[PDB]
Design a protein around this ligand. Structure first.
Ligand SMILES: CCCCCCCC/C=C/CCCCCCCC(=O)O[C@@H](COC(=O)CCCCCCCCCCCCCCC)COP(=O)([O-])OCC[N+](C)(C)C
Ligand SMILES: CCCCCCCC/C=C/CCCCCCCC(=O)O[C@@H](COC(=O)CCCCCCCCCCCCCCC)COP(=O)([O-])OCC[N+](C)(C)C
Ligand SMILES: C#Cc1sc2ncn(CC(=O)N3CC(C)(F)C3)c(=O)c2c1-c1ccc(F)c(Br)c1
Ligand SMILES: C#Cc1sc2ncn(CC(=O)N3CC(C)(F)C3)c(=O)c2c1-c1ccc(F)c(Br)c1
Ligand SMILES: C#Cc1sc2ncn(CC(=O)N3CC(C)(F)C3)c(=O)c2c1-c1ccc(F)c(Br)c1
Ligand SMILES: C#Cc1sc2ncn(CC(=O)N3CC(C)(F)C3)c(=O)c2c1-c1ccc(F)c(Br)c1
Ligand SMILES: CC(C)CCC[C@@H](C)[C@H]1CC[C@H]2[C@@H]3CC=C4C[C@@H](O)CC[C@]4(C)[C@H]3CC[C@]12C
Ligand SMILES: CC(C)CCC[C@@H](C)[C@H]1CC[C@H]2[C@@H]3CC=C4C[C@@H](O)CC[C@]4(C)[C@H]3CC[C@]12C
Lengths: 426, 421, 426, 421
């Protein structure tokens, strides 16, 4: 009857929020007018409690919580939820240079009898299945890679970019030189109407109808028209190659990239300490070589890892698809790429002598066939705030075309000065 | 003893059967033998055939390395009474019919894990996700009519025509201090759209400076408009035929256009789940059931059947191995019921623990993720987006004609508005 | 002393030419003024005997022949060369449903004692090494894929392609409609100078200076300028996407290709009958599934296979890199793609009891270290007649821009008629 | 007995050594340990260190699978006296020193097959091609000055100008039946280069038809010129520093600019071949030799050494594992002496046939071609051509200024030609 349950914080599965007022949080409803069921979590104030080592009665809600409530009504049992203090899923280590091996996280407490039921996105694994028996997977998934995409390194922050600044000068100086030779080849065979041909052939403004008169200057004007076309067409083609950069460099395709084989200064990637991905990394034959790299980059939890990915602190992150995909759906700056490797789902582990393995497995299979957790998928993680912008050319927003507006605006404010100068000229 | 028999069903890429070599008379190398039961001699049962079959695939290779993991030998034989298994009249059939009648003690194949199949026969750790999926000849192609305005968002277009009014309303300020606003709008705008039109240029020296600093803006506008243009005019947005199982079409097939021809293969787990969850759908779809998956594919391509519902993994395999990418599952590979391919075991047996721990090292060491690509991979499984090297029909370039026709009618509206006012 | 040698015809290694006059061919020299050494070849005319069912004397020359002459002066032996009648490298088969397995091709004669030395680009293989002992590889190579490239299926055979022919009509009909409304909205608020604005805004010919006068027709003229820009910019951008077809250079990438896993009606590929690649196909675990396909497409020899690749009869071919690379260097229509899988070099097989294995191996290693066959590589296969700048944008030749020339030419011939019509008009 | 020792040398990716686990004290899974001897106790020889290492790689795994192929156990240990082997004073060293003094009976590593190493120690079938290769920091970048004429070949450009001559010479024929040829050249040509310039249009109705059928040609000309343009103005043609070993630079290092700093690792097969084939080169390059490949890479990056000559496979491996693609082998992977990595055996031993068949079974079943990509692969292994997303400098866009300068001078030539004639 009385059951103790440990849970880890995972945004698409376990939403943890400290309770206020008396210790009971609100009863906010979903988009479709449905109540967000809550459970009590006598969990640590912060991960790795340390100095604020207090068991705050927070409230938890999410996919796993609704699965717990369904199994609670079906199985007729009482339960309590308390977060794991270390905040890790669980790996096998040893202490004091002893032969015996000790577990961490969930199995550091469930194996000690402190927890009866485990309800968390715990990936099924050999080392995990040796000590506890997992039920059938309630959500099949595989590991995936989340990239930064904060800067695709082809960002037009200026429209002067297509040319480099010692070519803008030498295009804007080669105008006056050719003007002051059109004028001289015509004079000795006007200056304002030569300097106007010279420009209005470049910009294609068609302004200034003076054409070079003398046969010497028509050759130079013809070739200056050719130069103007090639200059402007190179600006245009190079701007396009900057914008048609909808295919950003080489995206990592699964765990196949040679850059993943070898650590490098530029490329850094890691996962959560003492997690399933660490066991997979040490459990892969080729992956022992670069195990040195992420050992210094591994994060304590996935939340701050994803925060690092969002900023310019981590390039690529590896984690379960059910988490990274949801995070990429909530935020447009982060997307995931690469084939889903290690197609191992989650599951509910059970003790060796626990008389509930068969019945809990049948319960979750029944929840599968009746479509209960399909409804949970639509309710909990189906927002899809972003769009499948990949394989689709982007649309140039404002602030993505703001420079040309500032160009014409600055031309106006300079003109109101130039008009004073011109009236004063006469 | 460690010697236990294995049973399988010839279905899906997991179980592909080959015969013996005409010159060798045996199975090929690295091929475990297979046997299949035969019946002849009219009403009575004839002598055994003992044919030498070679049934392999993905699940068979999984069986091979788990057998080397646990160090047991085995033999393979095929079910003939039933294919998947139905508890008809209280008697199990097919795979479960064999397992409940022993003589196999094991079962490897395209067997779906569910509560009804588990109450009598426990299953191991599934080695691949699967479930129910609807695949159709999803096709159409709807180029959005306003694809010629997509290079910029609405903010930018509207701010372009506000800057144009601002600039043309000052170039007849920097030009006063016969060129009116009606000609500064017609100039400042004929520069945006190349410089094709006949304009009436200013004459003051500080106003040509403004026309020039605007012609540079026009150059950048046409450089950033046409950058992607022939990829917006060719981008087709395919509309999925059915939103999902619980859509209004499947709930009430009759009160719509002639109902979708959708069915499955009867006497299977897929029909087993649908009759429980949606019996009203089952009553209608019983008439559209078909014998095999090949019949379903042929029916969909011919068009008599316009939707198919079946196991997720098999349909995903068949989608990528079609002439063209016409056939594809609904929801881009959406599964409406998550299950897995398990291994059927007799209850209360110590082999289940060994089998689970013998499947999981394939996940851990990742020596079967390459096996995933070894067989289950198709051409259409990768796709080539929606852009191609295709001509532009009217269908593509018919948001430009709508705009031309709309101005062709607004000009006449304002013509009569002149002639009256 | 007396040694019998069999050889197969391979273009980059073995050039075979039926001798004329008394039975000796020419003594033509190389580009650097060096004689092309020849040897006698009593092989069958036109591959299989057929009507010329006789081993007609011929002269052979090439890489292997020069290696033979070098080993001839070093080892001090006599030799004769005669081509294999069946024209195959050799595989293991059986006849009359017998348990014994028989060899064909080279080992169908060397194992019978008919040949003492084997000199041919015979790939080293397990089934090949069981019956004879191979020396050290004198040229290391791997299998590669040669694609057709005769038609990349993005061939501009007209400049009218970027638009489909029921859009050219509807652009050339929507000119007259808008002209005859510019004229009417101006008349009732000229026709030739409306029909000239209407065109010279589309083509950007800037011809016809009439601008719509009345406010009704300036709106329609403005929007027709917008329509003209979008039409011409779509023609231009779509022509570019036709010409910027550098992407179709991405083709089958090695054996690892999903289209190679499964046979299809469009995709056909095969190799030479009873060759090393056939064994590799049956020696590969996954390659037995589609082994049904090329069994009906496999060719008797690589020469006609490459001829089929050149035409629209074979799409992809698989063979040794030292052959396909040379063929792709001689002809621009054929190129090779994909990683070099099965990196197994050639070699010189030896009999089990023949007392020359060690010394011949030392001889070829000595030829390696002194750079003799490096000189042979430069002499025999180093022509490089084709450009190696793949992924370099192409240059539009004439006959690749001939249509526009015919367009302006046809405009001239139509104008000499239209001028008669115009003078007659008044 | 089937138990035989294996000896190796810590070098190349084929032999990468790892230490013991601090918590476990053993090598990792699927790891065969290694052995090594240390020298201590001042002048005398101390006891061996007996530190058991974990040395693996692309050769060690082949050793694993051939160990299961022939069913033999073994142990691994490293050479202490010598690295590769030199017959100095008639005594073999290193690998050959161990093999000829027995107590090894085997040798796995990056041992180059050659006649000198084979006369005393026969080698098996090589499992990977290799040889001699020269790698440098070959990277300058030279955009061809006439990259603005590349969009069309010279044939097409010249035919364009002859058409512009024979069209302007008829538009002053369809127009004479003040618009002379001097203005039909200036019109017909101002349409090719957009329509920027001020022209003087005809007036006859059949001549505007010709200007229009020419403006359509101009539209196609600028659509097919600028199609690839920003990929021709960015395409850099890297010039390789050294054509080959037999170039005039290596033959006579002194009679040129200060001679190239090229060397190798002494006491190896690479130097062994070069001293025989080119002793004059050897005399000069003896002063530039360095201890190890890492020293060579650091020297090349720092610039003190400007060329390195070594084994082909190792240099190929190091090329793809560099910060940037600055370091690249000469000839795009050109090898001037084809050899292979074999296994050293004692002469007249029956294990050679078994080893050869075991090696060739990997070629046959193709289970090591994936092993080729498992380790010997780098970032720079797939260069992204020469085009990138790069600005256009004055280096790129300087064939347009040369043409403008050439006309800037031809206009003055024809100016004086007017003012005299
Ligand atoms: C008599 C008749 C007169 C007619 C007059 C007509 C004039 C019309 C022309 C207008 C264009 C001029 C706009 C000036 C803006 C300066 C931008 C700048 O400094 O920043 C950039 C550096 O800039 C460079 O790279 C240097 C460019 C030098 C000036 C160019 C002169 C020649 C232009 C040749 C024109 C040929 C056109 C060919 C077609 C393509 C970099 O940007 P950033 O790092 O983000 O810094 C922000 C900039 N900010 C500080 C301003 C916020
Ligand atoms: C009063 C003022 C008058 C001014 C007059 C100015 C006129 C200047 C305009 C000139 C362009 C016209 C050239 C005609 C060539 C015909 C080509 C043909 O038939 O073949 C193609 C089919 O063609 C089609 O797809 C149908 C096109 C219908 C005619 C287009 C009219 C509208 C053009 C709208 C122009 C808007 C431009 C927008 C900018 C892009 C296919 O080619 P193929 O299969 O290889 O067959 C070989 C063809 N051959 C048989 C000839 C060898
Ligand atoms: C001050 C200021 C700012 S904020 C800004 N934000 C975005 N962009 C991009 C842009 O306008 N694009 C046009 C495109 C499609 F090519 C990309 C800018 O250029 C600027 C400028 C800017 C830059 C160069 C300038 F010369 C001037 Br004036 C202003
Ligand atoms: C004058 C003028 C204006 S005001 C304006 N305001 C909004 N939009 C776009 C829009 O509403 N949407 C894009 C979407 C469908 F996503 C939503 C315009 O295109 C214009 C034009 C316009 C555009 C092309 C032209 F060729 C011409 Br003429 C005018
Ligand atoms: C008769 C005839 C021929 S032979 C020919 N050979 C090649 N090309 C290609 C071409 O010119 N291109 C311009 C590009 C870069 F876009 C590709 C042709 O167009 C033609 C025509 C043709 C085609 C349509 C026509 F309308 C006419 Br009239 C002639
Ligand atoms: C008038 C005129 C002519 S005649 C001519 N003949 C040959 N070539 C190219 C050429 O020789 N080669 C391309 C190569 C370097 F591969 C060999 C030309 O570019 C021109 C021009 C021309 C070209 C661009 C212009 F902008 C102008 Br104005 C004139
Ligand atoms: C530019 C001034 C003169 C106005 C004339 C152009 C106007 C009327 C144009 C500009 C954008 C055009 C629209 C662009 C988008 C759509 C949505 C599509 O589902 C049908 C066509 C439709 C509805 C077009 C109708 C006409 C339209 C609204
Ligand atoms: C347009 C006419 C009147 C005169 C100008 C000629 C222009 C178009 C062209 C013709 C061929 C061109 C040259 C083609 C090739 C090279 C070789 C290179 O090492 C320097 C640039 C240079 C020399 C180019 C300069 C520009 C050039 C001289």
């Amino acid at each position: 009857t009385r059951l103790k349950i440990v849970t880890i914080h995972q945004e698409p599965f376990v939403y943890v929020k400290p309770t206020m007022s008396d210790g009971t949080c609100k009863e906010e409803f979903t988009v479709n007018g449905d109540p967000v069921k809550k459970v009590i979590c006598t969990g640590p104030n912060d991960t790795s409690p340390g100095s604020p080592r207090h068991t705050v009665p927070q409230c938890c809600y999410g996919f796993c919580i609704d699965l717990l409530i369904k199994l609670a009504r079906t199985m007729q049992f009482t339960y309590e939820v308390h977060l794991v203090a270390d905040g890790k899923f669980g790996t096998q280590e040893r202490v004091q240079n002893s032969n015996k091996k000790e577990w961490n996280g969930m199995m550091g407490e469930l194996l000690s009898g402190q927890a009866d039921m485990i309800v968390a996105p715990l990936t099924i694994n050999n080392e995990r299945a040796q000590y506890i028996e997992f039920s059938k997977p309630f959500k099949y998934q595989g590991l995936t890679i989340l990239v930064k995409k904060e800067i695709p390194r082809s960002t037009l922050d200026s429209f002067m970019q297509p040319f480099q600044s010692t070519l803008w000068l030498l295009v804007g100086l080669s105008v006056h030189v050719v003007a002051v030779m059109l004028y001289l080849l015509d004079r000795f065979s006007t200056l304002s109407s030569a300097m106007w041909f010279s420009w209005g052939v470049l910009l294609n403004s068609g302004i200034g109808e003076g054409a070079p008169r003398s046969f010497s200057a028509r050759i130079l004007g013809m070739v200056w028209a050719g130069f103007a076309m090639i200059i402007v067409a190179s600006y245009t083609a190079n701007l396009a190659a900057f914008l048609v950069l909808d295919r950003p460099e080489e995206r990592i395709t699964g765990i196949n990239d040679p850059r993943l084989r070898n650590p490098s200064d530029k490329f850094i990637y890691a996962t959560v300490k003492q997690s399933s991905v660490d066991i997979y990394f040490r459990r892969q034959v080729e992956l022992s070589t670069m195990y040195r790299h992420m050992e210094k980059h591994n994060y304590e939890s996935a939340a701050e890892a994803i925060q690092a990915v969002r900023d310019n602190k981590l390039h690529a992150f590896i984690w379960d698809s059910a988490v990274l995909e949801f995070e990429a759906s909530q935020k447009c700056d982060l997307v995931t790429t690469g084939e889903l490797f290690f197609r191992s789902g989650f599951g509910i582990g059970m003790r060796k002598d626990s008389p509930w393995k068969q019945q809990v497995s049948l319960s979750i299979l029944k929840s599968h066939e009746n479509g209960f957790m399909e409804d949970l998928d639509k309710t909990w993680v189906r927002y899809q705030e972003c769009d499948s912008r990949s394989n689709a050319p982007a649309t140039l927003t404002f602030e993505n075309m703001a420079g040309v507006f500032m160009l014409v605006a600055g031309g106006i404010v300079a003109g109101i000065f130039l008009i004073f100068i011109e009236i004063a000229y006469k | 003893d460690d010697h236990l028999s294995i049973v399988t069903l010839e279905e899906a890429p997991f179980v592909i059967v080959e015969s013996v070599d005409p010159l060798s008379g045996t199975c090929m190398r690295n091929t475990v033998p297979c046997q299949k039961r035969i019946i002849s001699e009219n009403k009575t049962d004839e002598e055994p055939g003992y044919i030498k079959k070679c049934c392999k695939g993905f699940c068979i290779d999984i069986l091979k390395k788990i057998s080397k993991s646990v160090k047991f030998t085995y033999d393979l034989y095929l079910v003939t009474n039933g294919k998947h298994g139905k508890k008809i009249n209280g008697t199990w059939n097919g795979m479960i019919g064999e397992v409940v009648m022993k003589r196999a003690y094991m079962a490897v194949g395209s067997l779906t894990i569910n509560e009804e199949r588990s109450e009598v026969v426990d299953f191991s750790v599934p080695f691949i996700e699967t479930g129910i999926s609807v695949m159709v000849s999803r096709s159409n192609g709807t180029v959005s009519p306003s694809a010629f305005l997509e290079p910029f968002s609405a903010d930018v277009w509207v701010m372009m025509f506000v800057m144009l009014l601002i600039v043309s309303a000052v170039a007849v300020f920097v030009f006063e201090y016969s060129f009116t606003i009606g000609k500064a709008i017609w100039l400042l705008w004929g520069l945006v759209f190349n410089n094709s039109v006949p304009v009436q240029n200013p004459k003051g020296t500080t106003s040509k400076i403004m026309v020039s600093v605007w012609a540079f803006f026009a150059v950048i506008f046409l450089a950033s408009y046409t950058a992607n243009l022939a990829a917006f005019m060719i981008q087709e947005e395919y509309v999925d035929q059915v939103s999902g199982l619980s859509d209004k079409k499947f709930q009430r097939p009759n009160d719509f256009s002639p109902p979708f021809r959708f069915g499955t293969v009867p006497n299977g787990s897929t029909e087993r789940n649908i009759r429980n969850n949606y019996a009203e759908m089952h009553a209608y779809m019983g008439k559209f059931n078909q014998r095999g998956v090949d019949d379903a594919l042929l029916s969909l391509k011919t068009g008599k059947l316009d939707a198919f519902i079946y196991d997720a993994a098999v349909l995903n395999y068949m989608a990528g191995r079609d002439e063209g990418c016409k056939l594809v599952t609904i929801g881009s590979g959406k599964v409406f019921a998550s299950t897995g391919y398990g291994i059927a075991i007799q209850k209360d047996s110590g082999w289940k623990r060994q089998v689970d721990l013998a499947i999981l090292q394939l996940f851990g060491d990742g020596e079967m993720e390459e096996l995933e690509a070894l067989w289950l991979t198709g051409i259409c499984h990768n796709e080539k987006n929606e852009v191609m090297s295709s001509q532009l029909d009217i269908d593509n370039m018919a948001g430009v004609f709508y705009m031309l026709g709309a101005a062709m009618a607004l000009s006449l509206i304002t013509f009569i508005c002149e002639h009256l006012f």
